[PDB]
Design a protein around this ligand. Structure first.
Ligand code: 0E9
Lengths: 99, 99
């Protein structure tokens, strides 16, 4: 799908048997999503954006059905305003920037 | 251009007689550039990112050449670790997310 940027590139993701909406962020190196009930064993981790640094939990090996397309990777959970599909899954679904 | 997301999508800009590298970012509705000498009246404003809210100075009607493509926009100068080109100019240079 070709998404233009007049409006926030929000997508539909099915993760953890839960449906969520998420920004497609080429600016984040990492996928970070808001608090959500999720299976597994996690690790502490912190990430930084503008303003500061949040303490996330890292879940390695998670399946997301992004835009009705799948990938498996690292989903970090923590204090975000929006769910961010970062570059480590974007490459997996084969997304690119074009101009 | 076709940009794959495997590396961090930095690119060259020319803002105010100066030459810089900027993250092309779909997750920002705004171009926030680090501090530099920009000449003009500026408003304050404040934006949110993952960790907080930065106090930044609005410059409106500034010309940038992002990849050879000039475009006029509003540009925020303030405390960021990276220059970000947001959707307010990404629309303008014709950029499109894709998969
Ligand atoms: C650049 C900001 C103006 C932009 N915020 C934004 O557009 O908010 C709207 C707003 C407008 C008016 C009033 C209030 C709010 C933003 O933070 N956008 C995010 C995605 C987002 C959108 C809304 C809220 C929160 C997040 C993302 O682009 C940044 C860019 C960026 C990239 C690299 C470094 C710094 C900034 N990456 C991030 O913040 C990611 N960091 C990242 O991946 O960086 C790696 C790294 C970390 C630390 C040190 C070096 C490198 C996080 C998602 C983890």
């Amino acid at each position: 799908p070709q998404i233009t940027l007049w409006q926030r590139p929000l997508v539909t993701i099915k993760i953890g048997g839960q449906l969520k909406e998420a920004l497609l962020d080429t600016g984040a190196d990492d996928t970070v999503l808001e608090e959500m009930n999720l299976p597994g064993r996690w690790k502490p981790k912190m990430i930084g954006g503008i303003g500061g640094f949040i303490k996330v939990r890292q879940y390695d090996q998670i399946l997301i059905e992004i835009c009705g397309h799948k990938a498996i990777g690292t989903v970090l959970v923590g204090p975000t305003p929006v769910n961010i599909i970062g570059r480590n899954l974007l490459t997996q679904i084969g997304c690119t920037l074009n101009f």
